[PDB]
Design a protein around this ligand. Structure first.
Ligand SMILES: [Mg+2]
Lengths: 49, 38, 1321, 537
RNA sequence: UGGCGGUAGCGU
DNA sequence: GGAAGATCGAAAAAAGCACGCTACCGCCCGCGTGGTGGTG
DNA sequence: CACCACCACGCGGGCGGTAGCGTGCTTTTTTCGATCTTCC
C-alpha cells in the first residue's frame, strides 16, 4: 500500500498541470505566449535556446 | 423557503410629528414653497 | 343493454349523469400500433423494415460491374414462445430473412448488359418481437420502450427576451433541425447583422452561404431588398413615386407635383398626406441632388466608353461618385428601399462586413470553419458543401420534417424532398428578416404542436437503418473483390452490425426500461408513458423551468397531474385516456362536432395546431337532451385561454370528463374535490401498492377498473365463446361453440394460468379462476383473476372501516392506528418471491460441480439438500442455510449458494439450465418429465376429443350399414374399426375413416415428439458456465408498525401502533373501527375527496349490510329483487339503468350474494355523485345522513364528547416495508482501497457521516465525537482494533491514530510531479 | 502502489477495468517503443512522432482529456486519470476525507412515541442488539457467563434470555445520536436516551420533530452510537435534546406544540354558557377533575374555584396567595400541571398555539430549564389525552357554504358582463378593463371569504337558562383554524369559499377565477388552471 | 469479493 | 503624424451544478495474425 | 508432412472509414485580433 515505483522516461515530457492549468506556470515563467509553448512541446515549431 | 422563479409623485404622511431634513439645500420659490436644489 | 356474463355476477352502481358517446379505447394501442407499423409488410416504402431496405438498397459496388438489390423480406416464426422465453431466459425474437438479387454485368459492355442474375434468401439477424401486452422479452426480462417527446424537425424561430447584450434588445434566431444531418442556425447580432452557424460552431456572416450557393451580389440585393429607380430626367433626378414608401418617414425634401405643393420642408408625414398622394396617383417627383447621397446603389454600374466600373454594388453613395455616374451617361440608376423600422438594411450591412467576394472564397471560408487545420482545396470544399445539406446520404428532412418546414413557411405543398435547397434557405432567411422587421411572430418551443412523439417502432427503424448502412458499407467493400461468379449473396453481407445495433437498442438504451410489475396499474402507466429524457432530447439537470410547466396544449393529450415528484418533474408525462398519435407523430384528442348549435355524435380527432382555430366547448356543460346548450353563455377555450362564448359560436364539444386526466388520475374517486398536488401524490402512489393475498373490490370506484384490468394482460380472457368444459385451480379447458368452430379442429381452448411467479419487483403474480363447470362464456369474458384483480375489476387495496379522530397522539402528524383485527384477518398480508442463482462454471484447474456433500459441515446442514445437492421444494429455510451444494477444486473449496442473512421463506420453484453436452442431473430429468407430462396431457385431451368424434362417426356409419349397434356397444372400440362390413361403398368409407384415424394418430404423436424435443432441446449459457440453478423463495409479509400505507387521495402515512381489538373505539352496536386517522391532515392538505369517499363507503357498506340481513333470514327472492332494484334506481338523472325483471330469478341470488359484502359504487372522475345522492343512499341504508356516529372509548368506555366521522375507505399498502429499510451494523467488511465501511443494505455496511453532519458536529462542541467518527470508526484500522479491544475489556478510551484515507490521498498526489509531506518541526 | 489500484477478481475468470493500470500500460508501451527507436538510431520524423505520442500518453495519464480528446476505454467513456480521483464531488477529498461511512450506525423509519419523555427515543430491540454488540460481549465476559468471546457471540446471536437483560443494562445511560438525512442546521442531529421497544421502527418524540423537520409519512433516521467516555459526555451535555431549547439562528424556542396538543389544550380551555354543572363553587382543581371524570360537570362549565398561586419575591422564594377565581373546569384541571412559580393568568384563556408558546416562554424565563422540560412533557401528555377525549372530527357538513357567496358571485357576473358591454362600446381599453375585472373579482372573493368567516365563527346560537345567546362556534374546522393547530384563513377559505384568482405559468392573472369550493365540484377548466400553479410550485 | 454507467422510486 | 498603449467586443476554455437511501440491469479489450497443434 | 483450425498474443489505440462525430445552462477568466488614441 505504500511502496511506490518509477518509470525512466526516454525523453522529457512536460507536466500537464504546470502547462494547461490557467494561468500557465511555464508560459508565465518563460514570458512566452502559451500557443508557442504547446506548439513547441508537441513538435510543431522550433525554439531557439 | 425562498423563491427562484422570476415574476410615485407625492409623499404621504401617516403619523403626527415634526419633519426634519438631512443634507438639504433649498430655495423659496415665487409662491413661498420650498424647492430643493440637492 | 344486456350485461356480460362476468358483469352480471356483480353489477357496479354508476352515479354518472352525462351519457358517454365514445368508449374508452385500447390502453396499449400506442405501442402495438407502432410495432405493427414497424414489422408489417408495406407495399409502399414509408415505414418499417421495407422503408429502411428501400432507402439503403440497391447497393452499388465501387465499379459499375456488379450490384446487390433487395426484393422482399419475411419474418420467420419465433423458435420459443413468450412463456418459454421468460422461463429459459432467452430473448423473444423472430428470424429475419431477406430476398437478395446479385447482378453481375458484362465486363466488356458496361452500358447496362447483364451477365448473371442470382436470387437467394439470407438471414441477417433476429428482430425482437413485442408480445400481446406491448412489452418485450429481452434476456428473459420484461422491458418497456417508452415513447420520447422530442422536437419535431423543421424550421423554428425564437429569440432571447433581453437575456443578452445587457440592453434588453431581442436577438432573433432561426434553427433548421433535420431528422438526420447538420443543424443550420441564422442569428441576429446586437449590431443588426445576420450570421450563420453550422452545428453550433463559430459564426460567419449570413451572406457566405448565399455566395456559396452561386449567387452574385446583385442577385442577393434583388432578392432581399426592394428596388427604386433613380431615373435621370432632364434634371432633379426624378423617381417613381410609390406612396407605400412614404409611411412614417421624415420629409426633409419638398414634395411637390403637378404644380401642387403636397408637403413642405420640415413637415412630418401622417395618414392625411399619405391619403393625398394616394388619391393624386403621383408618379414623378422632383428630388434634390443631396437626397441621392443618402442611398445605396444596388447593381454594379460600368462605363461603356472606358470599359471600367464606375461603381460596385452595396456601398454608400457620395457626391463625387454620383457626379461621375451622371457624367458617364448612365441615365438609369438603381437603389435599395431601406426603412429604419420597416425594411432594415441587415443584408447590406452583413455583406459589407462579409470579407468574401466570390463563390470560391465563400466555399474556402466554409471549409476552413468546418475543418480547421486541413488545407482548403477547391474540390474538397465543393464536396463538403454539397454533402452538408444537398445529399440524401447525409441530410434527411423527414416527411413530418418537410411538412413542418412547409407549414412554417406558409406553403401549400406537403410532399417535398428530404434535402434542402436554395429556395428553402432563402425563404427561411427572408422569414427571419420579416420577423425582425415586425411582421411575424416567434414559435412556442414548448407548444405540443411543435413537439413530436417517437414510439418503439420509429427508434427500432432508426437503429435498423444505422445497422443497415453499416452492412451496406461492408458489402460495398466486399463486392469489389472480383470472382463474383462463384459467390452467393449470402456471404456478401454480414449480420454482425445489424444484430449488434438491435441488441444495443433493445438492452442498453435510456428508453428500454425495466418493466414495473407492482400491479396492473403500474404496467399500464409505464406502457403509456412519454419521456423527454431520451437520446437526442433533454437532460435531467439542464432541463429548466419553462419546459416542465403545464402548457395549455396539454389539455386532452398529457395528464396535468400524473408526473413524477422529483428531479424529473414535467419531463415525464402520462398519455391521456382518449389521446392518440397522428401519422406524423403529433398528439391528437377526440371531439364531437357541433353543427348549428346541436351537438352531433361524430368524432373528429383534433391536433394541437388545428385546435386553436376552433372554439371547443366543455364536457361539464348541461344539455337539454336535444343537443342545444341550456345556457347561452358557455365556458370554452379559443386559443390557449378560457372565456365565455355564445351558444352559436361553439365549434367542438369535449367527448368526456375523463379526457383531461390519465388512467391513474381517472382511477381516483372525487378527484375534483382534491388539491392538484394531493391528486398528483395519490396518482403516483396508486401504482406503488403491492397485491395482497386476497383481492378486495373498491366499494367506491370510478368505473375505469374494468378497462384497466381487461386491457392489462394480467387476467385470462376467453378467446372464443363456449362452456367451461373443465375448470381447475391451475388450468381451464373451454369447449367452444359450434358458431366459432374452425374446420378440422376439435374446438377446445386451454388456458394455463400462471401460479406464484415472481415479478420484476419481487412480488407474487397469481391467477385464480372465477368460473365454474358448465358456465357459459362469451368472447372477451374474463376466466381468471390476475394479481390485484377481483372479478375483472382492479383491486389495489382493501376496504377499511376508518374513523377520523385524534387518538392519544398515536396519529400525530401522518401516522395510522391499526386495529389488531387487521393483522388477524391478514387483510394486508402480501407474498414476496425472491430468486437466487447458483452458477457452476469452468475454471482453469477443473470444472466445478453441484454435489450433495460439503466439506467441513455437519449432517444437519444437508438434511434439506437432496442427493443431487439441491434443496427440496417446499423446505422452509432461513439465513445461512445451504440451498445449492457446489464445490470448486483448489482438494475442493466451498462455493455453495447460501440464503442471504435476514432472508427467510419457503422454496417453491427450482429451475436447472444445462449447457448442451453437459449431463443432466436427476432434478433436471424430473423437471423436464413434468413438463413432458403436462404437454402430453394437453395433446392427449385433444386426441380424446378428436377420436371421440371420429368413433361417433364410425358408429353412425356402422349402424347405417349393418345396424349392429347392440353388438357394437358390447365390443372394444378398436374392434369397430377392425370389423369389416359387406362389400359396398360402406367398406370404402370405413377404410377411408380408418386411414384418417391412423393419420390423425400419427400427426398427434409427431406433435408430442416435437414438444418433447423442444422441452429437452438444451439451452446454451455464457462462455465459461456449464450449469445454472435458480431457486425461488416465497415469504409472507404482514402489516406491522413502520409500514407505509396510503389512500387514493395522497394521504400517505406509516403505521404507528397495532392497537388491541378491545382498545379501539366502538359504536353502539359494539363493532370496533379498523383505522383511526387524524382529522388535522384534512384542513391543510386540501383533499375533501377523502371524507366524501368515506361517507359514500359507509353508505355502500350499509346497503350491503341490509342485503346480508335479507340473506341471513332466508327471505324470498321477491324481497331481494325489490330491494336491489330500489338500491340501483337511487340517484338523480343517472345514465345507468338496471332491470332485475330479466334475471331469470337465479342470477338475482348470485348478484345478492356478491353484493352482501357491499354494493360497489362508480363515481366518475368529474361526473360523480353529489352530496344529496350520498345522503339519499345513507337514508336507504338506515344510516345517519351527516355521516357521523357516536363512538365509545375502548379503554375507559366513556362516550366521546362529539360525534366522529366513521366510514369505509380504500386503503393501499405501498411497497415501502420497514423490514426492507431497517438496518444496523457494528463491525463488518471494509473497502479494499479507502479502508472504509461498505455502503448499502444488501452488503453489511454503515451509514455515511457526510459533510453536513460534520458541519453540524462542528457547530456543537463536538470535538471528540467528530474525531471518533472520522478515525476510530471509519479509517484507522489500528484505532478500530484498539477501540474494539478496549470496549471488549471494558475501557471506553480511544486512540485516534492516522486515517488511511489521508495516506491514500497523499500517495495519489505524490504520484503526480508534486511532493507533499507532513513536516515534524 | 498496486494496492491503491487493485486488480480485483470478477469470480468468472476475468478482472476489473482499472483505468489507472491501462494508462500506465499505455505510458510504458510508449516509453519502451521510444527507447527501442532511440537505440536504433531513428530519423528525426519517427522519433518526433514517438516522442509526441509518449507526451500525449503521459498527459492523458496525468489528466485525461485536459488538452485533447480523452482516451476512451472499454465502456465508451473517458478513463479515470490521476487528477480525476482527486478533484470533483466523487474525488477523495469530498468522498473519503470530509465525510465517510461509520461503524456502529443504523437506519430505520420513524414513528411517533407519545409516551416518551423529551430526552428519550424508542429504539428497536434488534437494532440496539446489533449496535451494542461489543458492549454486550464485554458485559457478558465481566459477569462471567461465557469463557471466550466466541462463546459471547454464540450467546448473542442465538438470543438467550439473559441477552435482553445485558442489553438493557448497557443502554441504561448510553445516549444515541439521531440524525435526519438533510442536516440543514445544527439541530439536525440530537442525542437521546434509548428505550428498547418491539418492532422495526425508531420511536421519536413529537416535540423534537419540528427541530428535525421530520414528518411520519416514510421518513428515515440514522442512529449512531458514541463508544467513548468523552463522546457520551458531550452527547449528554451538548447534543442532548433537553439542552437545545432555543434556535441558534435567532434565539426563538424550538419546542412548541404543533398539531394535537394545541387542539387538546384549546378544547379543554373553552367555555359554553349553559354547560352541565355551571355556576357551582369548587374547593379546588381536584374537585373540578373529579366532577369532570364523574360526568356531573362539563369541561366548558363556567364555575368559581379556589386556587392558590405562588409568586416570586425579591429575595427569590415563593409566596402563596389563595383566591376564588371565575374560570372553567378545563382550565382548573389544566392548572394542576403548571409549576408553582407561574401565575394563573396563563391558563385563564382559550390557550391557543400562541398562548401555549407564551406560557412556555414565561415558564422558561421565570423557573428555569428542568421545570420547563417537565412542563412541556406534561403539556404534551394532557393535550394528547384531551384531544383523544374530545373526539373532534372533520365531516362534509363542517365546511358550511353561505348562500350570500352565491349572491355575491352572481353580482360579480353581472358586473363583469357590464364591463364587457362597456368594452364592446369602446369606452375602455383592454388593459384597463382587464384590471377592473381583476379588481372586481378580488373584491367579490374578499366579500365571499368575509361572509363565510362570519358564518363560521359565530354560527352557534345556543339557549341559556332563559333565552338565546350567540357564542363562539364549536365547528371542528373553525376550532382547528382558530387554535392554530393546522390550517390558516386562506386554506379554510379555499375549502369553504371560492378559490380566488389563479395565475397562468407566465405570471399573468386569468380574468375568470375559480368560483368553486373544494367541497363543491371543480370543473375540468378549474382543475386544469390550478394544475399550472401546482406544477410551478 | 470492486468500480463505472443507465433507469425508476423514497424522504426532504 | 504613424506605430505602442489602452480599449474592447467576441470567441474560447474552465469550473460548478444538495444530502441520505432503496431496487434493477449492462459491462468490465481487441482483432485479426501468427505460432503451433491436429490432419487429409 | 506441408496445409487448416485453435489459442497465445502484441502492440495498439478513436473507429471505421474510402468522414465525421457535437446540436435545450450559467459564471468567470483568458486572449486575441481589431480599433481608436496620442506623443516621441
Ligand atoms: Mg415525510
Amino acid at each position: 500500500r505504500e511502496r511506490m515505483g518509477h518509470i525512466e522516461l526516454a525523453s522529457p515530457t512536460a507536466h500537464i498541470w504546470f502547462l494547461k492549468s490557467l494561468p500557465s506556470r511555464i508560459g508565465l515563467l518563460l514570458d512566452m505566449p502559451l500557443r508557442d509553448i504547446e506548439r513547441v512541446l508537441y513538435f510543431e515549431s522550433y525554439v531557439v535556446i | 423557503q425562498l423563491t427562484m422563479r422570476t415574476f410615485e409623485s407625492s409623499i404621504q404622511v401617516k403619523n403626527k410629528g415634526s419633519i426634519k431634513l438631512s443634507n438639504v439645500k433649498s430655495v423659496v420659490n415665487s409662491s413661498g414653497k420650498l424647492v430643493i436644489t440637492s | 343493454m344486456v350485461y356480460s356474463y362476468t358483469e352480471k355476477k356483480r353489477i357496479r352502481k354508476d352515479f354518472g349523469k352525462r351519457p358517454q358517446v365514445l368508449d374508452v379505447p385500447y390502453l396499449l394501442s400506442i405501442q402495438l400500433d407502432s410495432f405493427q407499423k414497424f414489422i408489417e409488410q408495406d407495399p409502399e416504402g414509408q415505414y418499417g423494415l421495407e422503408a429502411a431496405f428501400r432507402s439503403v438498397f440497391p447497393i452499388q459496388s465501387y465499379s459499375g460491374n456488379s450490384e446487390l438489390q433487395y426484393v422482399s423480406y419475411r419474418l420467420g416464426e419465433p423458435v420459443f414462445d413468450v412463456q418459454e422465453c421468460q422461463i429459459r431466459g432467452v430473448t423473444y425474437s423472430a428470424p429475419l430473412r431477406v430476398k437478395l438479387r446479385l447482378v453481375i454485368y458484362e465486363r466488356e459492355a458496361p452500358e447496362g448488359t447483364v451477365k448473371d442474375i442470382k436470387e437467394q434468401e439470407v438471414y441477417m439477424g433476429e428482430i425482437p418481437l413485442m408480445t400481446d401486452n406491448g412489452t418485450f422479452v429481452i434476456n428473459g426480462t420484461e422491458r418497456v420502450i417508452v415513447s420520447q417527446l422530442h422536437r419535431s424537425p423543421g424550421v423554428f424561430f425564437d429569440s432571447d427576451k433581453g437575456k443578452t447584450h445587457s440592453s434588453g434588445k431581442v436577438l432573433y434566431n432561426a434553427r433548421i433541425i433535420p431528422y438526420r444531418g447538420s443543424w443550420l442556425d441564422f442569428e441576429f447580432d446586437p449590431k443588426d447583422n445576420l450570421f450563420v452557424r453550422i452545428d453550433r460552431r463559430r459564426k460567419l456572416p449570413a451572406t457566405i452561404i448565399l455566395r456559396a450557393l452561386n449567387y452574385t451580389t446583385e442577385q442577393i440585393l434583388d432578392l432581399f431588398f426592394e428596388k427604386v429607380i433613380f431615373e435621370i430626367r432632364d434634371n432633379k433626378l426624378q423617381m417613381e413615386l410609390v406612396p407605400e414608401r412614404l409611411r412614417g418617414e421624415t420629409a426633409s425634401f419638398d414634395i411637390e407635383a403637378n404644380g401642387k405643393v403636397y408637403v413642405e420642408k420640415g413637415r412630418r408625414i401622417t395618414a392625411r398626406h399619405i391619403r393625398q398622394l394616394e388619391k393624386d396617383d403621383v408618379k414623378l417627383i422632383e428630388v434634390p441632388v443631396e437626397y441621392i447621397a443618402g442611398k445605396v446603389v444596388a447593381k454594379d454600374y460600368i462605363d461603356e466608353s472606358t470599359g471600367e466600373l464606375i461603381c460596385a454594388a452595396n456601398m454608400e453613395l457620395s457626391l463625387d461618385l454620383l457626379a461621375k455616374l451622371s457624367q458617364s451617361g448612365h441615365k438609369r440608376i438603381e437603389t435599395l428601399f431601406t426603412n429604419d423600422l420597416d425594411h432594415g438594411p441587415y443584408i447590406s450591412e452583413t455583406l459589407r462586413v462579409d470579407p468574401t467576394n466570390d463563390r470560391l472564397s465563400a466555399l474556402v471560408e466554409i471549409y476552413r470553419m468546418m475543418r480547421p487545420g486541413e488545407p482548403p482545396t477547391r474540390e474538397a470544399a465543393e464536396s463538403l458543401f454539397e454533402n452538408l445539406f444537398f445529399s440524401e446520404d447525409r441530410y434527411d428532412l423527414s416527411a413530418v420534417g418537410r411538412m413542418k418546414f412547409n407549414r412554417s413557411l406558409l406553403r401549400e405543398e406537403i410532399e417535398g424532398s428530404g434535402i434542402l435547397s436554395k429556395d428553402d434557405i432563402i425563404d427561411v432567411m427572408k422569414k427571419l428578416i420579416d420577423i425582425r422587421n415586425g411582421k411575424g411572430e416567434v414559435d412556442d418551443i414548448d407548444h405540443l404542436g411543435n413537439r413530436r412523439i417517437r414510439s418503439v417502432g420509429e427508434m427500432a427503424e432508426n437503429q435498423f437503418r444505422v445497422g443497415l448502412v453499416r452492412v451496406e458499407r461492408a458489402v460495398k467493400e466486399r463486392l469489389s473483390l472480383g470472382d463474383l461468379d462463384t459467390l452467393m449473396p449470402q456471404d456478401m453481407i454480414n449480420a454482425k452490425p445489424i444484430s449488434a445495433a438491435v441488441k444495443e437498442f433493445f438492452g442498453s438504451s435510456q428508453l428500454s426500461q425495466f418493466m414495473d410489475q407492482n400491479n396492473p396499474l403500474s404496467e399500464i402507466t409505464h406502457k403509456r408513458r412519454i419521456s423527454a429524457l431520451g437520446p437526442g432530447g433533454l437532460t435531467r439537470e439542464r432541463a429548466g423551468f419553462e419546459v416542465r410547466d403545464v402548457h395549455p396544449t396539454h389539455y386532452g393529450r398529457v395528464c396535468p397531474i400524473e408526473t413524477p415528484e422529483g428531479p424529473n418533474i414535467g419531463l415525464i408525462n402520462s398519455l391521456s385516456v382518449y389521446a392518440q398519435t397522428n401519422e406524423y407523430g403529433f398528439l391528437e384528442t377526440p371531439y364531437r362536432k357541433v353543427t348549428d348549435g346541436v351537438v352531433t355524435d361524430e368524432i373528429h380527432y383534433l391536433s394541437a395546431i388545428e385546435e386553436g382555430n376552433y372554439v371547443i366547448a366543455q364536457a361539464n356543460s348541461n344539455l337539454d337532451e336535444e343537443g342545444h346548450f341550456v345556457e347561452d353563455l358557455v365556458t370554452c377555450r379559443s386559443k390557449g385561454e378560457s372565456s365565455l362564448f355564445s351558444r352559436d359560436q361553439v365549434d367542438y364539444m369535449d367527448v368526456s370528463t375523463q379526457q383531461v386526466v390519465s388512467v391513474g388520475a381517472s382511477l381516483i374517486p372525487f378527484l375534483e374535490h382534491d388539491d392538484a398536488n394531493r391528486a398528483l401524490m395519490g396518482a403516483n402512489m396508486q401504482r406503488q401498492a403491492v397485491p395482497t393475498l386476497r383481492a378486495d373490490k373498491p366499494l367506491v370506484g370510478t368505473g375505469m377498473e374494468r378497462a384497466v384490468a381487461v386491457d392489462s394482460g394480467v387476467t385470462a380472457v376467453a378467446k372464443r365463446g363456449g362452456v367451461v368444459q373443465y375448470v381447475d385451480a391451475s388450468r381451464i379447458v373451454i369447449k367452444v361453440n359450434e358458431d366459432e368452430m374452425y374446420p378440422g379442429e376439435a374446438g377446445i381452448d386451454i388456458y394455463n394460468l400462471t401460479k406464484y411467479t415472481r415479478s420484476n419487483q419481487n412480488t407474487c403474480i397469481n391467477q385464480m379462476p372465477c368460473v365454474s363447470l358448465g358456465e357459459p362464456v362469451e368472447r372477451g369474458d374474463v376466466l381468471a383473476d390476475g394479481p390485484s384483480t377481483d372479478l375483472g375489476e382492479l383491486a389495489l387495496g382493501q376496504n377499511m372501516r376508518v374513523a377520523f379522530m385524534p387518538w392519544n397522539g398515536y396519529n400525530f402528524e401522518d401516522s395510522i392506528l391499526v386495529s389488531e383485527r387487521v393483522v388477524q384477518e391478514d387483510r394486508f398480508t402480501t407474498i414476496h418471491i425472491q430468486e437466487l442463482a447458483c452458477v457452476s462454471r469452468d475454471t482453469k484447474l477443473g470444472p466445478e460441480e453441484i454435489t450433495a456433500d460439503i466439506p467441513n459441515v455437519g449432517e444437519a446442514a444437508l438434511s434439506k439438500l437432496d442427493e443431487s445437492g439441491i434443496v427440496y421444494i417446499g423446505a422452509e429455510v432461513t439465513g445461512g442455510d445451504i440451498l445449492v451444494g457446489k464445490v470448486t477444486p483448489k482438494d475442493v473449496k466451498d462455493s455453495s449458494l447460501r440464503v442471504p442473512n435476514g432472508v427467510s421463506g419457503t422454496v417453491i420453484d427450482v429451475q436447472v439450465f444445462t449447457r448442451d453436452g453437459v449431463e443432466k442431473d436427476k432434478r433436471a430429468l424430473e423437471i423436464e418429465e413434468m413438463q413432458l407430462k403436462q404437454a402430453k396431457k394437453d395433446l392427449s385431451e385433444e386426441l380424446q376429443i378428436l377420436e371421440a368424434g371420429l368413433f361417433s362417426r364410425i358408429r353412425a356409419v356402422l349402424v347405417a350399414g349393418g345396424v349392429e349397434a347392440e353388438k357394437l356397444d358390447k365390443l372394444p372400440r378398436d374392434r369397430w374399426l377392425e370389423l369389416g362390413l359387406t362389400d359396398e361403398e360402406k367398406q370404402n368409407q370405413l377404410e377411408q375413416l380408418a386411414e384418417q384415424y391412423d393419420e390423425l394418430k400419427h400427426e398427434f404423436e409427431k406433435k408430442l415428439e416435437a414438444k418433447r424435443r423442444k422441452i429437452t432441446q438444451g439451452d446454451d449459457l455464457a462462455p465459461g458456465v456449464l450449469k445454472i440453478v435458480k431457486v425461488y423463495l416465497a415469504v409472507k409479509r404482514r402489516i406491522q408498525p413502520g409500514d407505509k400505507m396510503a389512500g387514493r387521495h395522497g394521504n400517505k402515512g406509516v403505521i404507528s401502533k397495532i392497537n388491541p381489538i378491545e382498545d379501539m373505539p366502538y359504536d353502539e352496536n359494539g363493532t370496533p373501527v379498523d383505522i383511526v386517522l387524524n382529522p388535522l391532515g384534512v384542513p391543510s392538505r386540501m383533499n375533501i375527496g377523502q371524507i366524501l369517499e368515506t361517507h359514500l363507503g359507509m353508505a355502500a357498506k350499509g346497503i350491503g349490510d341490509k342485503i346480508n340481513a335479507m340473506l341471513k333470514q332466508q327471505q324470498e327472492v321477491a324481497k331481494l329483487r325489490e330491494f336491489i332494484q330500489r338500491a340501483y334506481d337511487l340517484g338523480a338523472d343517472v345514465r345507468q339503468k338496471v332491470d332485475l325483471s330479466t334475471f331469470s330469478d337465479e342470477e338475482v341470488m348470485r348478484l345478492a350474494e356478491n353484493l352482501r359484502k357491499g354494493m360497489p359504487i362508480a363515481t366518475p372522475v368529474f361526473d360523480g355523485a353529489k352530496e344529496a345522492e350520498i345522503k339519499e343512499l345513507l337514508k336507504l341504508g338506515d344510516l345517519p345522513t351527516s355521516g357521523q356516529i357516536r363512538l365509545y372509548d375502548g379503554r375507559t368506555g366513556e362516550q366521546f364528547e362529539r360525534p366522529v366521522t366513521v366510514g369505509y375507505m380504500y386503503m393501499l399498502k405501498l411497497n415501502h416495508l420497514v423490514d426492507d429499510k431497517m438496518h444496523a451494523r457494528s463491525t463488518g467488511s471494509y473497502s479494499l482501497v479507502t479502508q472504509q465501511p461498505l455502503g448499502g443494505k444488501a452488503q453489511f455496511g454503515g451509514q455515511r457521516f457526510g459533510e453536513m453532519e460534520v458541519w453540524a458536529l462542528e457547530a456543537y462542541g463536538a470535538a471528540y465525537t467528530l474525531q471518533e467518527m472520522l478515525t476510530v470508526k471509519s479509517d484507522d484500522v489500528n484505532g478500530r482494533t484498539k477501540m474494539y479491544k478496549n470496549i471488549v475489556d471494558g475501557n471506553h478510551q480511544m486512540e485516534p491514530g492516522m486515517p488511511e484515507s489521508f495516506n491514500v490521498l497523499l500517495k495519489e498526489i505524490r504520484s503526480l510531479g508534486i511532493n507533499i509531506e507532513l513536516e515534524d518541526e | 502502489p498496486p494496492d491503491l489500484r487493485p486488480l480485483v477478481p470478477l469470480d468468472g475468470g476475468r478482472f476489473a477495468t482499472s483505468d489507472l493500470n491501462d494508462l500506465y500500460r499505455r505510458v510504458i508501451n510508449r516509453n519502451n517503443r521510444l527507447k527501442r527507436l532511440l537505440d536504433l538510431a531513428a530519423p528525426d520524423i519517427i522519433v518526433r512522432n514517438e516522442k509526441r505520442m509518449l507526451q500525449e500518453a503521459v498527459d492523458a495519464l496525468l489528466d485525461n482529456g485536459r488538452r485533447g480528446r480523452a482516451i476512451t476505454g472499454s465502456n465508451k467513456r473517458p478513463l479515470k486519470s490521476l487528477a480525476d480521483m482527486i478533484k470533483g464531488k466523487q474525488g477523495r477529498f469530498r468522498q473519503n476525507l470530509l465525510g465517510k461511512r461509520v461503524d456502529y450506525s443504523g437506519r430505520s423509519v420513524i414513528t411517533v412515541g407519545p409516551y416518551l419523555r423529551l430526552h428519550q427515543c424508542g429504539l428497536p430491540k434488534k437494532m440496539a442488539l446489533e449496535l451494542f454488540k461489543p458492549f454486550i460481549y464485554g458485559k457478558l465476559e465481566l459477569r462471567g457467563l461465557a469463557t471466550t468471546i466466541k462463546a459471547a457471540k454464540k450467546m448473542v446471536e442465538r438470543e438467550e434470555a439473559v441477552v435482553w437483560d445485558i442489553l438493557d443494562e448497557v443502554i441504561r445511560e448510553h445516549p444515541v445520536l439521531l440524525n435526519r438525512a438533510p442536516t440543514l442546521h445544527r439541530l439536525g442531529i440530537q442525542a437521546f436516551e434509548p428505550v428498547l421497544i418491539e418492532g422495526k421502527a425508531i420511536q421519536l418524540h413529537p416535540l423534537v420533530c419540528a427541530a428535525y423537520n421530520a414528518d411520519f409519512d416514510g421518513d428515515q433516521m440514522a442512529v449512531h452510537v458514541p463508544l467513548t467516555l468523552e463522546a457520551q459526555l458531550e452527547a449528554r451535555a451538548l447534543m442532548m435534546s433537553t439542552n437545545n431549547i432555543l434556535s441558534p439562528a435567532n434565539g426563538e424556542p424550538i419546542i412548541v406544540p404543533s398539531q394535537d396538543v394545541v387542539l387538546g389544550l384549546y378544547y379543554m380551555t373553552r367555555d359554553c354558557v349553559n354547560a352541565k354543572g355551571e355556576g357551582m363553587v369548587l374547593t379546588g382543581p381536584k374537585e373540578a377533575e373529579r366532577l369532570y371524570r364523574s360526568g356531573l360537570a362539563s369541561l366548558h362549565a363556567r364555575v368559581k374555584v379556589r386556587i392558590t398561586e405562588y409568586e416570586k419575591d425579591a429575595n427569590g422564594e415563593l409566596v402563596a396567595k389563595t383566591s376564588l377565581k371565575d374560570t372553567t373546569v378545563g382550565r382548573a384541571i389544566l392548572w394542576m400541571i403548571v409549576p408553582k412559580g407561574l401565575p394563573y393568568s396563563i391558563v385563564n384563556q382559550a390557550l391557543g398555539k400562541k398562548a401555549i408558546s407564551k406560557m412556555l416562554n414565561t415558564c422558561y424565563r421565570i423557573l428555569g430549564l428542568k421545570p420547563t422540560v417537565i412542563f412541556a412533557d406534561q403539556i404534551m401528555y394532557t393535550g394528547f389525552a384531551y384531544a383523544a377525549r374530545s373526539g373532534a372530527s372533520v365531516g362534509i357538513d363542517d365546511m358550511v357554504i353561505p348562500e350570500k357567496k352565491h349572491e355575491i358571485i352572481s353580482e360579480a357576473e353581472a358586473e363583469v358582463a357590464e364591463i364587457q358591454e362597456q368594452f364592446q362600446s369602446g369606452l375602455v381599453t383592454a388593459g384597463e378593463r382587464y384590471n377592473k375585472v381583476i379588481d372586481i373579482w378580488a373584491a367579490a372573493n374578499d366579500r365571499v371569504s368575509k361572509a363565510m368567516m362570519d358564518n363560521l365563527q359565530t354560527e352557534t346560537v345556543i339557549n341559556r337558562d332563559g333565552q338565546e345567546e350567540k357564542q363562539v362556534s364549536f365547528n371542528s374546522i373553525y376550532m382547528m383554524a382558530d387554535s392554530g393547530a393546522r390550517g390558516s384563513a386562506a386554506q379554510i377559505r379555499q375549502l369553504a369559499g371560492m378559490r380566488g384568482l389563479m395565475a397562468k405559468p407566465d405570471g399573468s392573472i386569468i380574468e375568470t377565477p375559480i368560483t368553486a369550493n373544494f367541497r363543491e365540484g371543480l370543473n375540468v377548466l378549474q382543475y386544469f388552471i390550478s394544475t399550472h400553479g401546482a406544477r410551478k410550485g
